[PDB]
């Protein structure tokens, strides 16, 4: 045939949460635009529940102890091997064996433990506890998380945080997302394909990321020319990071989300940003005047993080925190259609064959 | 944009092409890269070797010794703690991303992994306060699945072994189900062996997987104390229950993997034998009087049971068994979707509701702005 591997263009769910409008330049949450969302200051909490109930009313329950303590130095694995720990320990059933009301807690309640194990990760071993009546006091869950984290948070970094979240909340059907849909249509429990969908976006081509521009935003800042070091870098062979193909139509919706809100909130590093993305683009489409080049989300969204204080190597396990909506979302939707994902395979190989006709057959013992 | 005679879950959708393994269910045969089944198991081919069969094409190769667990955590479920264990393979034991690895790399992270796998299920089945068994009467065993046995028994009977060889060796690779398609979408994005493999272990633990052995000890109880092995099946479906190990077809025929075990089951003389296939004999006839139109046969986890049992397993240890066995579909896959390098990304189509404002969303009244 003239088929292509891994399902590409071939059509697998139908579904009710979000639209990723790429023709028409927009992102809706179950019609609800994200633009509407961040510009009225909608919390990543009631966005989580607009993504999974369909409609706001129901929040996110509060935090509790771990279910493990671990701690390796791997916040991505730390979170997989607690998922695990939740049918032993705290009672997590099979989605064939509860209702839709017990699965939706279940996402939620995991929800909230994989945010506590990141926000925890983050603050220092040896600095004072927060006390737990300051965590369970604080509006949104955009707020218990930082001041879990940094104790006293700045308010325009919680800001940039629900920014940030909301605009990755979902994005479609990637491989993350698909993955959950694949172990939920089994009937395992919602830990096992919340486990792995975070497999999935541990692989490096999963899909979006906060592009690693931090050494080269801290090398414009110090020569002060953007036009140079942007044809430098191209120039030695190395790529450009966060400036590529294009993704929508033209820019990402939310793409200028997080440039608007690294603006509004007066990000210190805003202006270097934008001399970096206009050499980056007039360069780009100065070298392939065929392609079309738009700038990456994951570039305002690593100035985004950074500006709330993110360090690099925490930063792809705040792009995690937020797609526990989606991921929730589509989990649950997949537990109403309890339909089981199976395709098939074409076989290719070698035709029949004796044993003494496999090679290194000399080798092996028996009896 | 439309559904076009749209059914949801992929079913019959080509995703892969494979060289690995083909259950030719027209034919009613099963093949491992060409190699019958049947000729496997009848000429005693133990595991180790049929693993390295399936990852790597030919023979030659074997799996690493044993070795500590990476992480002393038991919380009394083995897939949980298995789990747990996969995860700590990266920042423990250096597994770096596919992306990242040659083949011979990931062939041995894999094979590490089974092992380790292997070892979880085994001593996870001995009494910690009996005796401990010697590190040097481990060592001077020859095949992985004697090294299993030996762990766990002690003194393993050697009929036992080859029951256990029996078992994994038609368990080890069955085609493209949710656990192994699970496994190639994780290792179609480049992370390392260890994410891969726990996702499948995930979709396996599944109750709509399938394939785990049938809970029909208690039946095959109850006929012999009263022996009459078909007013025994007679009643259970008067009454209504399910009758465990038969229903639909899987090879169009008979499932060469069953006639495989059933074989086993009387070459190596199981005492559980006889009486199985008298509950055989009269479930079957009894299934096609009921419905003279269905096509109905005898599931291969049935006789899985029967084999199993024999072996010593218990009941609820029968389903780490099966997880063993199929880490060598798992691996082989993975190093198969490695060398593929594509990703793995379907698409789905929105039926939602248009474009709204946040203000006409049921429950705008309970939001607070920041």
């Not at 697998?12 to 009225?40: C, H, M, N, W």
């Not at 800001?159 to 959950?180: C, K, L, P, Q, R």
Request: a negative charge.
């Amino acid at each position: 045939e003239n088929f292509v591997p891994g399902l590409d263009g071939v059509v697998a769910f139908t579904t009710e949460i979000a639209e990723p409008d790429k023709d028409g330049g927009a992102l809706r949450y179950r019609g609800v635009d994200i633009e509407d969302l961040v510009s009225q200051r909608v919390t990543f909490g009631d966005v989580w529940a607009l993504l999974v109930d369909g409609n706001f009313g129901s929040g996110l329950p509060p935090a509790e102890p771990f279910p493990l303590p671990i701690h390796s130095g791997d916040v991505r694995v730390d979170v997989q091997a607690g998922l695990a720990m939740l049918a032993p320990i705290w009672g997590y059933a099979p989605l064939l064996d509860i209702d839709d009301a017990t699965a939706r807690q279940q996402l939620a309640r995991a929800s909230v433990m994989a945010l506590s194990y990141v926000a925890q990760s983050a603050r220092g071993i040896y600095q004072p506890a927060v006390p737990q009546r300051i965590i369970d006091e604080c509006s949104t869950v955009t707020a218990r998380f930082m001041t879990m984290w940094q104790g006293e948070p700045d308010p325009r970094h919680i800001e940039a945080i629900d920014a940030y979240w909301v605009s990755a909340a979902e994005h479609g059907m990637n491989a993350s997302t698909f993955t959950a849909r694949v172990i939920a249509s089994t009937g395992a429990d919602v830990a096992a394909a919340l486990s792995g969908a975070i497999g999935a976006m541990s692989g490096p081509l999963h899909g979006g990321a906060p592009a690693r521009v931090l050494p080269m935003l801290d090398e414009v800042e110090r020569a002060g020319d953007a036009r140079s070091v942007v044809k430098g870098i191209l120039d030695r062979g190395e790529k450009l990071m966060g400036f590529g193909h294009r993704v929508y139509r033209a820019e990402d919706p939310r793409a200028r989300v997080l440039r608007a809100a690294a603006e509004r909130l007066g990000a210190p590093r805003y202006e270097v940003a934008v001399a970096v993305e206009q050499a980056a683009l007039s360069e780009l489409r100065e070298r392939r005047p065929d392609r079309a080049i738009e700038t990456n989300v994951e570039f305002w969204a690593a100035v985004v993080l950074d500006f709330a204080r993110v360090p690099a190597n925490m930063m792809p396990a705040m792009f995690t925190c937020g797609r526990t909506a989606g991921w929730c979302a589509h989990i649950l939707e997949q537990k109403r259609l309890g339909k089981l994902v199976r395709p098939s395979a074409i076989y290719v190989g070698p035709g029949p064959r004796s044993p003494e006709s496999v090679d290194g057959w000399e080798r092996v013992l028996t009896t």
